Design a protein around this ligand. Structure first.
Ligand SMILES: COc1cc2c(cc(C#N)n2Cc2cn[nH]c2)c(C)c1CN1CCC(Nc2ncnc3sc(CC(F)(F)F)cc23)CC1
Length: 466
């Protein structure tokens, strides 16, 4: 290092002292990713993993943080001999990047639960020799910064992380694993994934971080959870304040998911004088439209969740229709299973529960119910249209008869006289999927023909012998 100027704020005795440290680092030429991740992991450990002895805030003494920092930098500098990997042009080589990745990978415990909480930070790596998937990628970038490799940066999709490096920052390399039971492609480019138009690689519209965005990533990576039923209020407040610091300095401009995280925190505990959660969700969507060709799913899912929690059924349906309008221009590939799981839960659990409560409230006399609004029926239909269009030309199918039962049920929550008011043109809606085009006639009849719907959604050829 640490440099004298980095040590002057220690000891850190409060959340605000941690915010001051981040402010100071973010004001430097290069914020120190290693320092910052160790501090966050230290504080998270003593606020979320082990709170024994806690009276206010775990004091971060310079002696403790400097020793962790020395362990990390000694481990990396000792194992990576830069003289074996000459750098032309102030840029790194694939071989060097792969070496840094191997060094991190080879340091990890042979066997542990990869999906647990609080194994994201360099604190976890040094004290537990444990990292989660994206934590390995972050640790590679931190190590490269420690080594003076200014061109190596974190690349992020909505379910994976890797690195960019090299001339013009144009090279990509895998540095960590993805999912469970996938074969690792460490060392390789991400071009085959981009070319196949999978969600995992976002058609190439993934985030290419600068150092400031990498700070934002580690802040998003804070995990306030103590257990299933309990969050650390101290860690929530710290994450919230750090995200505001980043927001004010301009560093969330290109980070849709961080804006959604901040909005969720503001919903929980609003900060006086700040934009409402809805404003922030909309800024996340604007960020994705501006910088990422509107190819991201999570900006709309964050918005839909907020409306769902607040029982704004119309607005929740509209936001989920929007999620599907993004997904329809992807191919569903092996390794996209996480987004399949989220669409499945929305279609087959969340929407049914929302419409079930809506139906009870309609029986109880509600006015302006989404169930009496044809535009809400149109959103439900656009949702299914997008999922069906996603499935077209994909190497793996999406829909099956499990989805059909819930579709029939959800359609049935709207009376015939409401469904009839939607105009399906080749309230007005156009279908992109051949499945929904063929279902059009079925969608307005007073009694929904359940078996014909099922056949059209699953493209089931035949009916029972017997
Ligand atoms: C499974 O998680 C969710 C599902 C969600 C929602 C909102 C909705 C809705 N509607 N859903 C779907 C759902 C709702 N109920 N049941 C499912 C939300 C808000 C979430 C919460 N997740 C939103 C995305 C957030 N992810 C991130 N947030 C910031 N940065 C990054 S970088 C990255 C890739 C990497 F991990 F590094 F490999 C991921 C990621 C993690 C938390």
């Amino acid at each position: 290092g640490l440099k004298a100027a980095q040590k002057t704020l220690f000891p850190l005795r409060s959340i605000d002292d941690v915010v001051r440290l981040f402010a100071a680092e973010l004001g430097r030429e290069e914020p120190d990713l290693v320092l910052l991740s160790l501090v966050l992991g230290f504080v998270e450990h003593f606020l979320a993993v082990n709170r024994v002895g806690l009276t206010y805030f775990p004091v971060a003494d310079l002696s403790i943080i400097a020793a962790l920092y020395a362990r990390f930098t000694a481990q990396i500098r000792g194992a990576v001999d830069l003289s074996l990997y000459p750098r032309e042009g102030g840029v790194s080589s694939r071989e060097l990047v792969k070496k840094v990745s191997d060094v991190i990978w080879n340091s990890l415990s042979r066997s542990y639960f990869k999906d647990r909480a609080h194994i994201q930070s360099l604190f976890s790596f040094i004290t537990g020799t444990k990292l989660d998937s994206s934590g390995v990628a972050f640790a590679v970038v931190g190590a490269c910064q420690a080594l003076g490799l200014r061109d190596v940066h974190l690349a992020l999709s909505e379910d994976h992380a890797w690195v960019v490096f090299g001339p013009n920052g144009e090279q990509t390399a895998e540095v960590t694993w993805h999912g469970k039971g996938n074969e690792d492609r460490r060392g390789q480019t991400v071009n085959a994934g981009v070319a196949e138009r999978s969600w995992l690689y976002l058609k190439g519209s993934y985030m290419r971080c600068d150092r400031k965005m990498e700070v934002a990533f580690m802040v998003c990576a804070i995990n306030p959870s103590i257990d299933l039923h309990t969050d650390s209020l101290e860690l929530l407040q710290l994450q919230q304040k750090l995200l505001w610091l980043l927001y004010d300095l301009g560093h969330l401009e290109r980070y849709p998911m961080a804006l959604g995280n901040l909005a969720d925190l503001e919903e929980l505990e609003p900060t006086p004088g700040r934009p409402d959660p809805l404003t922030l969700y909309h800024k996340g969507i604007a960020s994705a439209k501006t910088y990422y060709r509107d190819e991201h799913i999570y900006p709309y899912m964050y918005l839909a969740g907020y409306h769902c929690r607040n029982r704004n059924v119309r607005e929740a349906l509209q936001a989920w229709a929007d999620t599907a309008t993004v997904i329809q221009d992807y191919n569903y590939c092996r390794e996209d299973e996480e987004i399949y799981k989220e669409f499945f839960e929305v279609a087959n659990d969340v929407i049914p529960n929302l419409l079930k409560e809506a139906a009870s409230l309609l029986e109880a006399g509600s006015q302006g119910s989404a169930l009496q609004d044809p535009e809400c029926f149109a959103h439900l239909l656009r949702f299914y249209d997008g999922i069906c269009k996603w499935e077209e030309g994909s190497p793996t199918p999406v829909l099956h008869v499990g989805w059909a039962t819930f579709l029939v049920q959800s359609l049935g929550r709207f009376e015939g006289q409401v469904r009839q008011k939607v105009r399906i043109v080749s309230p007005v809606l156009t279908f992109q999927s051949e499945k929904m085009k063929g279902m059009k006639e079925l969608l307005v009849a007073t009694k929904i023909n359940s078996s014909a719907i099922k056949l059209q959604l699953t493209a089931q050829s035949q009916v029972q012998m017997k």
